[model samples]
Target: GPHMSIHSGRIAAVHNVPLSVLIRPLPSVLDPAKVQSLVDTIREDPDSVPPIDVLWIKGAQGGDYFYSFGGCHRYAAYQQLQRETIPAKLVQSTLSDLRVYLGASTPDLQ
Candidate 1:
């Protein structure tokens, strides 16, 4: 895990995981227009957009997994562009915790 400082007092650990290893939450969907826009921007200038931030969860099956809690469009763009790795923030939590936080049962990261 890597440390990332957001506010002066707030510190969060992040990891540069390969996109191949990361899993998208089940039934994940994104807007085509948004994805295309990001793809174009990234193709023109890779640094134009910020990194893909994710919530990392240690699966009950004894494996580490992650999914983008935000920036789904950016993640899709990265995939379409054939990028290998993306920036992600690792949050140590459970699926139930995330469900309560997000208030939705569809994005089940199993």
Candidate 2:
């Protein structure tokens, strides 16, 4: 049995958005300067970078939860230039325990 938490969320920040989307033509403000800087200095770049995870809520426009959860670096670049707002896809998933593989596990255990 795979005892791992399967949590999924929309990658809110531009950095979190995978390069696949960043390089693509869409509603994203991926700065060339920032991208070059990161590539030049960062090592094991994948680990240092944040993951793209965000859930798309149906019929929820202009809401706090509407943004992606992952992508810190991309978000930082966009924020630095005051270019906020991006598009993302909606995904559905269930939370599970990391150690025991239980259903609906929370990070804050009491």
Candidate 3:
């Protein structure tokens, strides 16, 4: 299997990425009603919602780190259904790129 992290100049965003790989910086408090509706929509059509954004921290946690900074509701809905995968817009990033998330929400990234 070919991995995507080797690209130099520009690496394209990926789809059908796994939800479990994401490391959420903020705690998500999802509304059941919203999650229910989202599940219905996803059940009917897989691509109804946009791809969640993530930063692929290539070196963190032995190259298994995936930082999710967007699409809380989408992730929560899938979590309700125990879905393992979702689409994503991936950026090849590093620990330096995580200041916004680390400081803004979860200072425990400290």
lDDT of 1 at 3: 79
Q: What TM-score would every model get versus the actual structure?
A: 0.62, 0.30, 0.72
Give lDDT tens digits, candidate 2, residues 1-110: 88878887544333333323332212455567876565443433434544444443332243222234354555554444443343334344223312133234323221
Sort order, lDDT high to low:
3, 1, 2
* Per-residue lDDT value at 10 in model 3: 38
- Using lDDT as the measure, the top candidate is 3
Which 10-residue window of candidate 1 scores lowest in summed lDDT?
A: 101-110
Which order, best to worst by TM-score? 3, 1, 2
lDDT of each residue in 26-102, candidate 3, tens digit only: 77777879888888888999776778888876563465467886788889888878887988888777666777568
* Candidate with more favorable, higher lDDT: 1 or 2: 1
lDDT for every model? 0.70, 0.40, 0.75
Which segments of candidate 2 are over 4 A away from where they belong?
1-52, 57-64, 92-110
Clashes of each: 0, 18, 0
Using TM-score as the measure, the top candidate is 3
**Candidate 3 weakest ten by summed lDDT:** 101-110
